[PDB]
Amino acid sequence: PKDVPGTLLNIALLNLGSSDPSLRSAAYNLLCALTCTFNLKIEGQLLETSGLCIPANNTLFIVSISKTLAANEPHLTLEFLEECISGFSKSSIELKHLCLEYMTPWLSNLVRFCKHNDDAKRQRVTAILDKLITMTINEKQM
Amino acid sequence: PKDVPGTLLNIALLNLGSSDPSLRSAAYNLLCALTCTFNLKIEGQLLETSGLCIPANNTLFIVSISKTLAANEPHLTLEFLEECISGFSKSSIELKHLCLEYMTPWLSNLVRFCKHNDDAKRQRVTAILDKLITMTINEKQMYPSIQAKIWGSLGQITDLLDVVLDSFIKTSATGGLGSIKAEVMADTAVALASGNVKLVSSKVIGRMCKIIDKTCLSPTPTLEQHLMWDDIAILARYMLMLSFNNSLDVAAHLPYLFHVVTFLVATGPLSLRASTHGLVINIIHSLCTCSQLHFSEETKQVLRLSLTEFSLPKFYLLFGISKVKSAAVIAFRSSYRDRSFSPGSYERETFALTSLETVTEALLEIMEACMRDIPTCKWLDQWTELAQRFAFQYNPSLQPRALVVFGCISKRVSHGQIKQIIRILS
Numbered sequence: 001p002k003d004v005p006g007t008l009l010n011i012a013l014l015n016l017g018s019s020d021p022s023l024r025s026a027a028y029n030l031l032c033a034l035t036c037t038f039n040l041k042i043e044g045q046l047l048e049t050s051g052l053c054i055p056a057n058n059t060l061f062i063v064s065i066s067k068t069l070a071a072n073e074p075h076l077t078l079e080f081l082e083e084c085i086s087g088f089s090k091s092s093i094e095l096k097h098l099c100l101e102y103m104t105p106w107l108s109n110l111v112r113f114c115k116h117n118d119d120a121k122r123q124r125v126t127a128i129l130d131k132l133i134t135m136t137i138n139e140k141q142m
Numbered sequence: 143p144k145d146v147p148g149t150l151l152n153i154a155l156l157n158l159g160s161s162d163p164s165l166r167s168a169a170y171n172l173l174c175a176l177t178c179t180f181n182l183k184i185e186g187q188l189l190e191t192s193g194l195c196i197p198a199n200n201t202l203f204i205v206s207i208s209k210t211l212a213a214n215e216p217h218l219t220l221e222f223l224e225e226c227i228s229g230f231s232k233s234s235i236e237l238k239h240l241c242l243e244y245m246t247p248w249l250s251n252l253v254r255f256c257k258h259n260d261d262a263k264r265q266r267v268t269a270i271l272d273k274l275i276t277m278t279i280n281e282k283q284m285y286p287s288i289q290a291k292i293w294g295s296l297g298q299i300t301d302l303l304d305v306v307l308d309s310f311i312k313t314s315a316t317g318g319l320g321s322i323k324a325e326v327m328a329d330t331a332v333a334l335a336s337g338n339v340k341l342v343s344s345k346v347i348g349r350m351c352k353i354i355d356k357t358c359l360s361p362t363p364t365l366e367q368h369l370m371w372d373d374i375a376i377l378a379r380y381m382l383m384l385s386f387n388n389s390l391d392v393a394a395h396l397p398y399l400f401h402v403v404t405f406l407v408a409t410g411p412l413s414l415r416a417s418t419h420g421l422v423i424n425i426i427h428s429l430c431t432c433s434q435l436h437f438s439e440e441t442k443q444v445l446r447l448s449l450t451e452f453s454l455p456k457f458y459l460l461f462g463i464s465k466v467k468s469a470a471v472i473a474f475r476s477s478y479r480d481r482s483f484s485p486g487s488y489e490r491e492t493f494a495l496t497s498l499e500t501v502t503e504a505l506l507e508i509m510e511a512c513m514r515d516i517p518t519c520k521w522l523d524q525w526t527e528l529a530q531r532f533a534f535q536y537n538p539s540l541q542p543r544a545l546v547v548f549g550c551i552s553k554r555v556s557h558g559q560i561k562q563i564i565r566i567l568s
Contacts, residue, residue: 021474045431051453053420055383057329097286
């Protein structure tokens with residue numbers, strides 16, 4: 001579990017924009033644990049709680065957290081993007097528009113990995129791009 | 143034709159992103175004529191021609207022209223937007239996404255028209271906003287993206303906030319307390335308020351405190367039978383949504399938030415009662431996670447115990463939502479865009495002024511803990527004044543509750559005050 005900080009962080013943010021009032025609150029709590037357990041640095045402060053009424057139009061909140069983490073938490077990038085793409089297909093149309101909004105900051109951070117001393121991590125980025133190429137072919141409306 | 147340049151410019155840009163190779167080229171030429179005839183200033187250069195092979199993925203090109211013209215060609219604004227909205231509906235799904243892309247840069251320019259010497263042009267902008275409000279209600283699928291572009295950005299213009307908010311309330315009024323139109327405008331205010339928390343909070347609160355102050359004119363046995371009841375109910379849903387993540391600025395408005403909580407606890411349909419409970423749970427949470435205030439580590443322990451207490455079955459009974467497993471579920475409804483709310487079971491529990499003391503003293507315990515750290519705080523002196531005004535004024539729906547609270551919080555009493563209390567009993 002200590003080896004998958006990036007894989008969980010996508011589950012918390014994807015479901016914060018959900019449509020079930022009792023699934024946002026549970027997703028808020030998971031995000032709180034991650035920052036303390038892994039010392040992730042964010043703008044504000046978070047306090048675990050039960051009983052919160054989190055609003056449905058929770059969109060510019062997610063984009064703000066994602067933008068911050070991408071800026072000053074780069075190492076999560078590769079494992080973050082791999083999951084975010086995989087979460088795109090399974091989600092519905094309305095949630096698809098969200099995934100774009102907070103995915104974009106991370107995309108710009110691939111710079112370092114493209115020349116990562118040919119450590120076979122370079123082979124990973126090409127897999128991500130090949131995945132992105134598949135969304136464009138299929139998602140005609142967007 | 144000279145009178146309507148803005149109307150044509152939208153036809154050129156809409157048809158440049160088309161899917162017919164012989165309709166892009168015809169549209170490029172029309173755009174070329176417009177710049178020469180009207181001396182529009184753009185970045186590059188354009189040369190009329192026939193036979194051009196214009197690519198299909200012509201998207202960032204359109205957005206670059208629209209961005210430039212909007213920047214340094216403002217006078218076209220009003221007639222441009224009016225047409226662009228009308229063209230939104232008729233186009234297909236794929237073209238709808240384009241209209242958003244090049245519409246946004248213009249939205250800044252509404253700054254000057256909002257105060258255009260009341261030349262009846264101000265009446266025009268409000269029509270545009272009323273038009274934008276209608277796209278949001280209908281285009282459910284693109285909801286996550288309209289909020290980030292239209293309202294997220296339109297709400298960062300200080301001078302324009304006041305008028306925008308006013309239209310939100312008027313549209314909600316017609317729908318009613320449970321109507322979809324009023325339900326959605328409650329959510330949209332969250333995105334509008336992210337730009338200026340300090341200004342939307344002190345303007346949705348400032349309307350509530352005044353509506354309550356106007357029930358004195360035509361006193362009624364209970365609020366729910368008052369004419370202005372519907373205005374109060376919708377304005378409360380706004381307060382619920384803005385409370386999460388400290389979008390109601392507590393560090394300055396805590397007096398005016400408790401003051402209304404105490405006048406609402408255990409009043410209304412079961413949905414409205416789970417809303418007030420949630421509203422308190424969020425004002426306390428905002429305190430624990432606020433940086434403007436610097437609470438010592440001693441105080442923060444007091445708050446966290448309060449946070450847990452309010453979620454016990456004891457306080458569900460005080461607020462009047464016992465037999466409800468979780469408040470969040472009842473407060474929000476999933477199918478709030480498709481259908482309007484369907485209230486029922488008009489049978490409504492009673493309230494006991496002894497219950498109000500128990501809550502009214504739980505809040506007072508929280509506030510004093512804060513005042514210990516915050517030096518020379520004025521919270522308690524502002525809250526008392528608000529109570530003392532309704533306590534000694536005839537209003538058969540608010541007076542009893544404003545006496546049980548005036549005494550529970552007040553710190554000093556004089557002979558002149560006691561005589562009034564004892565002559566209200568007579």
